[PDB]
C-alpha cells in the first residue's frame, strides 16, 4: 500500500 | 518556538486558508 | 478523518506521521512542537489490551506530508526517535485518561513550508477557546469511515461540546484531562476522527495573535461519526505541566 522510502531511513 | 503556529502558506504570508474563517465565526 | 475534506498544500505543517519501519504503515498522526519534539497519544505506544508496546526503534516519523502513501521527494523530511516518554499516570487500563506522550528526535528537523510548529496553549489562551460551540480543528490520515483510506491528508472543523453532553453521551468515565467535540444529531452537520487519525492535533487558531494552537490530541471515540456520539480529546494545556518537565529534564 505504502511506497518504499530510501533505505537510509531503515538502517 | 517564537514562530511558532504561523504557517508559512498562509499566515507569513497573509493568505487564509478554505475554512478558517469558519473557526474564527465560533468564537463569540 | 470522517466527512471531512482534502487539506490545503502547507495547512497543517505541524501535522506528523508515525510510521512504522515493520510492516511498513501508517501508525498514528502526531504534531511537532519544536525542531526536536513531537507531540502524540500514548496509546500510540503503548495500549497492553492489544499488545502494543512500541519502542523507539520500531518507528518513525514522517514530517511535511500530504499524500498518505507516497514518499513526497525533497518535501518531506523522516526522523529516527531518541527516546519516547509516556505520561506517568497514563491510564490504559479504564478510560485512556492522560492519553499523553512525547517523542524527542535523534536530530533537529529543518523547517520549510511544509514543516512547521504548532503553539501549545497557556492557561489564558485554554480558558479564552475551550469553550463549548467554539470550533476547533482535527487532521489526520485515518479511516474515512467507520466500517477506505484518504490518498491524502483530511481536514474537519469541530465544535466543543459541553462537558455534561460529554458524559451523558458514554458510559466511559469522562476526566478532566479530555474534552468532547463533534456536532449534535440536531445540527445536521457531521464529522468526526477515526481509527488511523490516533495521536494527531485538535487545533484552534487564536483571534487575539492569529497563530494556530494544538488544544486537544485524539484519543478516543466510540465508532467514528455515530450520531449522538462525540469525539474525545487529550486536553493539552491540562497536562502541559508535564510537557514542560519532559522537555525541561531531557531537552
Ligand atoms: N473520534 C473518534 N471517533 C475516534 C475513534 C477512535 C480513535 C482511536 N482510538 C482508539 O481506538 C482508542 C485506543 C484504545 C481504545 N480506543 C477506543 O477508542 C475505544 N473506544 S470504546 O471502546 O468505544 C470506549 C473506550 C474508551 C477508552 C478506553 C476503553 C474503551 C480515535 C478517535
Ligand atoms: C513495554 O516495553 C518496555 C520496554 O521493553 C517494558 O519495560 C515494559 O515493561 C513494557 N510494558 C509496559 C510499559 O506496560
Ligand atoms: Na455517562
Ligand atoms: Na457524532
Redesign the pocket.
Known sequence: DFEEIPEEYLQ | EADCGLRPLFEKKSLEDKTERELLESYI | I?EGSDAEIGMSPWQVMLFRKSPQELLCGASLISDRWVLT?A?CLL?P??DKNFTENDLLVRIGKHSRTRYERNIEKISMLEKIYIHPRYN?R???DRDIALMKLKKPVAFSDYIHPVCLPDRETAASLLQAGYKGRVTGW?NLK?TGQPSVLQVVNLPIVERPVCKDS?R?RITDNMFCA?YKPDEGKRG???????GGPFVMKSPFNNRWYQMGI?????????DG????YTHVFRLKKWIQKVIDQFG
Open positions: 470522517v497519544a496509546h495500549y489490551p492489544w490504559w479504564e478510560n485512556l485515518g467507520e458514554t466511559i463533534g468526526d476522527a477515526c481509527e488511523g487519525d490516533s485524539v484519543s478516543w471515540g466510540e465508532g467514528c461519526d455515530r456520539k462525540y469525539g474525545f
